Structure formats: C-alpha cells, structure tokens
Design an enzyme around this catalytic site. Structure first.
Site, mmCIF file in Angstrom:
data_model
loop_
_atom_site.group_PDB
_atom_site.id
_atom_site.type_symbol
_atom_site.label_atom_id
_atom_site.label_comp_id
_atom_site.label_asym_id
_atom_site.label_seq_id
_atom_site.Cartn_x
_atom_site.Cartn_y
_atom_site.Cartn_z
ATOM 1 N N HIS A 1 31.084 31.930 -53.581
ATOM 2 C CA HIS A 1 32.090 30.946 -53.219
ATOM 3 C C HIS A 1 31.673 30.109 -52.014
ATOM 4 C CE1 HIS A 1 34.102 33.793 -50.281
ATOM 5 N NE2 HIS A 1 34.401 32.632 -49.718
ATOM 6 N N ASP B 1 31.023 37.692 -56.946
ATOM 7 C CA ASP B 1 30.934 36.738 -55.830
ATOM 8 C C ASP B 1 29.666 37.007 -55.003
ATOM 9 O OD1 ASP B 1 31.531 34.698 -54.083
ATOM 10 O OD2 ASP B 1 33.168 35.771 -53.066
ATOM 11 N N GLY C 1 35.598 32.068 -42.657
ATOM 12 C CA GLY C 1 34.393 31.781 -41.912
ATOM 13 C C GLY C 1 33.437 32.951 -41.802
ATOM 14 N N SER D 1 33.035 34.778 -44.579
ATOM 15 C CA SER D 1 32.638 34.857 -45.981
ATOM 16 C C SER D 1 31.137 34.749 -46.134
ATOM 17 C CB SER D 1 33.283 33.732 -46.777
ATOM 18 O OG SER D 1 34.655 33.977 -46.908
ATOM 19 N N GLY D 2 30.614 35.571 -47.045
ATOM 20 C CA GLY D 2 29.197 35.612 -47.310
ATOM 21 C C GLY D 2 28.424 36.577 -46.444
#
Ligand code: CA
Length: 223
Positions: free
Chosen positions: A40, A84, A175, A177-178
């Site tokens: 995402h 994801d 923020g 994320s990942g």
C-alpha cells in the site's frame, strides 16, 4: 509510533525511509540491493534513504539511492490489504557497515507472546497529529490469532498477525506503514493497518513475512 521511545541514532540499522520529496513510508533493508515494504506504500519515483535518524537534517551516515524497480505482490488486494508486501530494488548496492545493515529473513514463523521491536517516523498521537523527525521505537508482543480475530471480525487472513496491547496507548500509526517488526533478530512483520492508532481493543495488524520467504527469495534471484 504512539507510546514509544526515541530509538537512538542508527540503532535500527535496517530501517529505511521511502522518500518522494518527503517521507511517506518505512521499509527494511534485506540485502545490499533490496528493500521490503508494504504494497500500500507503492508509488513511482521512490528514493530510498538509508542510515537516517533525523529525516530533516543531514547528520553524516545517510545513503540516498533511487529505486530501479518495484514489485508489488502478485495477489495484493488493496480493499482487504491481504498480501500487503512489496519489494524495491535499488539502482546501486548500499554500503553495509554497523549503522547500515540488512535484517535476516525468518526461517520459521514467530509465535504469539514473542516480543518484537517496531520502529518508524509516523504519527505519535492517537488524537491529533505530531510527526517526529527522529526514529521512534516500540517493544510489543505478538497477540494470539484468536484475540486478533476477535478484535477485527471478518478481516484477518492467514497472512496477517496482530501485535501490541489490547488496553491501547501503544501502537504503530500512519507514516510507520511499510516498516519493520523484528523479533529475535529476524524480520517477522511489516506495518500494515489498524483502526485508528493506539485505541482500546484495536491492535496493529502486520503482514506475516514468514509466509512470503519463498516469493522473496525467488524474486530476488531473477531480478
Ligand atoms: Ca538525516
């Protein structure tokens, strides 16, 4: 990260910032030329920033390397966030040292109750907005699948796990994320989603990296 602590400069040496003019997602360095992040977080025009602590000040240990290719998982579903995960190849190899280092992929999946380290430059508030300039850290346990499914009925697949605190107050956030979830020195999760941040009975949900090791290894070997 809500309810965490300041990690300290370069204490999380595999953490990267993905930059498109500004920080927008985290990621993890898994070898000198490849980063893993969340699907995402996909966009064109990514610069990978390694060796960062303060993302707004050049402190001397940074390496800035553009992406040459991005590969979103073949079965990523943006509506459910199943699968994801995304791989990013760097245009040139990073220089590895004590402050910039890769994180190992797991050989086995981690069990509920294992303590992990989650890190990022995301929002530090559950209500309102405050984005830090330095890297924040949180220690949190993996929750049982039963507790995860009870918190998010109908939404948890076999490719997800929950981690955090059902009482609230401590979580990852927008923020982050990942970015990485590291347990016993292995990358076990990717910051993926949750309902709000740090809310009671709404823990963070993470991509279960151990399900993807074969895809990661085969993709790196041929790209
Ligand atoms: Ca910096």
């Amino acid at each position: 990260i809500v309810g965490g602590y300041t990690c300290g400069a370069n204490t999380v040496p595999y953490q990267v910032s993905l930059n498109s003019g500004y920080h927008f997602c985290g990621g993890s360095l898994i070898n000198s030329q490849w980063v893993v992040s969340a699907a995402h977080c996909y966009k064109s025009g990514i610069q990978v920033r390694l060796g960062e602590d303060n993302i707004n000040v050049v402190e001397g240990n940074e390496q800035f390397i553009s992406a040459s290719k991005s590969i979103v998982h073949p079965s990523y579903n943006s509506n459910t966030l199943n699968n994801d995960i995304m791989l990013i190849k760097l245009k040139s190899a990073a220089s590895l040292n004590s402050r910039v280092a890769s994180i190992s992929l797991p050989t086995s999946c981690a069990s509920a109750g294992t303590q992990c380290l989650i890190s990022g430059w995301g929002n530090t508030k559950s209500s309102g907005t405050s984005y830090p300039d330095v890297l924040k850290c949180l220690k949190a346990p993996i929750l049982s699948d039963s507790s995860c499914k009870s918190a998010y009925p109908g939404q948890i697949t076999s490719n997800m796990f929950c981690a955090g605190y059902l009482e609230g107050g401590k979580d990852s956030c927008q923020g982050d994320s990942g970015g990485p979830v590291v347990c016993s020195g292995k990358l076990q999760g990717i910051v993926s989603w949750g309902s709000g941040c740090a809310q009671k009975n709404k823990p963070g949900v993470y991509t279960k990296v151990c399900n993807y090791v074969s895809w990661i290894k085969q993709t790196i070997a041929s790209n």
